[PDB]
């Protein structure tokens, strides 16, 4: 299967160095003459190109933007099909989603395959894992409240991925405390409450925390 995916720390402290890795596979017969770029996007703002490295040739390119041009390094490890972005002296304004993207050789250039993006937060605040609480229920809604974590992101599945229909995970709220909370709800037929187990699986990679919570019938249901 084709893939292109970014990995690296979700949190970095100001002045420290960020290292992100782009890994790919599944298109080895299309890599001749290709290049890989890093592109970022602060929340609610435009795409910004950072750097490009040629896969077969030795050249690389970096943005001329004055606040970035001395802080960026791009490199490659062909033995692993990886491209690495190293960015020094990180600042809170560098908080953004970082994407890697491919340009194939066929002077026609473009970014035809993109990774899913990886969120990087630059902050002095420490990572904090979530506390998960059940949200007890023709249909019924039940869910999980994922409270007080930092930084983003959290993902939520149900029944180990087995249950996907009727699931809805909401974007997080940012509290004045600086911590995030989010909720995930699944809408199910009422009568399935007695025949189906519902467990939310919460993953907070930044804190290396995973939580399974079974959602039971409401206690003191008056």
């Amino acid at each position: 299967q084709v893939n292109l995916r970014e990995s690296g720390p979700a949190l970095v402290k100001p002045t420290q160095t960020l290292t992100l890795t782009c890994s790919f596979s599944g298109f080895s017969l299309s890599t001749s003459g290709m290049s890989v770029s890093w592109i970022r996007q602060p929340p609610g703002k435009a795409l910004e190109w950072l750097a490009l490295i040629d896969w077969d040739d030795d050249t690389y390119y970096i943005t001329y933007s004055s606040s970035l041009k001395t802080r960026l390094t791009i490199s490659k490890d062909t033995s692993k099909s990886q491209v690495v972005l190293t960015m020094t002296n990180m600042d809170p304004v560098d908080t953004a989603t970082y994407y890697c993207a491919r340009t194939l050789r066929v002077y026609v250039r473009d970014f035809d395959l993109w990774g899913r993006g990886t969120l990087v937060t630059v902050s002095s605040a420490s990572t904090k894992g979530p506390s998960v609480f059940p949200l007890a229920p023709g249909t019924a809604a039940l869910g999980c409240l994922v409270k007080d974590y930092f930084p983003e992101p959290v993902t939520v599945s149900w029944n180990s991925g087995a249950l996907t229909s009727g699931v809805h995970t909401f974007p997080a709220v940012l509290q004045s405390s600086g911590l995030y909370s989010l909720s995930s709800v699944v809408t199910v037929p009422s009568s399935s409450l007695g025949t189906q187990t519902y467990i939310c699986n919460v993953n907070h990679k930044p804190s290396n925390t995973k939580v399974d919570k079974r959602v039971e019938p409401k206690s003191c249901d008056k």
Binding site: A46, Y61, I62, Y107, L145, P171, S183
Partner: protein
């Protein structure tokens, strides 16, 4: 060098609209322009390349052109799913060489049927109350256009503090979602017989209510 796009564009279903991208001789003037579609919160996808070519899978209603130092994306028959941000990009051979993206254009498809919000309201869980906290959670989904206002009541009186509400965000089905949280102490929660979340969307207000329970 920068690429210049209008910050926003709009049309109604079935209309044909264009989005422009203005550059210079060293980018658009001498290199292929590409366009990208992005739903906020998800990765961009290639939409047009080589000035006027359509990547595999992209619907035929999308087309691109370029002349001199400006390029244009045309959408011929707006559909609901076309609501997105659109970026142009081009390589620039000046200086040491660099890519440039435009600032993006947010496209709204106006004149669509309204979709009223589904609202679910949860009370604090017994587990949270045991942890000396109380959160009411109002989840709002499947609405269009993407704007709501939320008001909370304690019994029949307006709530004056403790509410945090998210900005609306696009769902995968091109409708919007948002959530509102009311934080109380367990003592505040038990000091009223009900609480309500009232959601107003395009002048229409609905509400859900929950009531504390006590089993001693």
């Amino acid at each position: 060098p920068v690429l210049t796009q209008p910050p926003s564009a709009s049309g109604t279903p079935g209309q044909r609209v264009t989005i422009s991208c203005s550059g210079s001789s060293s980018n658009i003037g001498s290199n292929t322009v590409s366009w990208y579609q992005q739903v906020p919160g998800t990765a961009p996808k290639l939409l047009i390349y080589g000035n006027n070519e359509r990547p595999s899978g992209v619907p035929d209603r999308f087309s691109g052109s370029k002349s001199a130092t400006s390029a244009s994306l045309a959408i011929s028959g707006l559909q609901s799913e076309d609501e997105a941000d659109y970026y142009c990009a081009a390589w620039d051979d000046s200086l040491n060489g660099f890519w440039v993206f435009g600032g993006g254009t947010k496209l709204t498809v106006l004149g669509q049927p309204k979709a009223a919000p589904s609202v679910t309201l949860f009370p604090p869980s017994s587990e949270e109350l045991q942890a000396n906290k109380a959160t009411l959670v109002c989840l709002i989904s499947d609405f269009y256009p993407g704007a709501v206002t939320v008001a909370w009541k304690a019994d029949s009186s307006p709530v004056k503090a403790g509410v945090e509400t998210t900005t609306p965000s696009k769902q995968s089905n091109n409708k919007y979602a948002a959530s509102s949280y009311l934080s109380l102490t367990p003592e505040q929660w038990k000091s009223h017989k009900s609480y309500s979340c009232q959601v107003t969307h395009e002048g229409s207000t609905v509400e859900k209510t929950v009531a504390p329970t006590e089993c001693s």
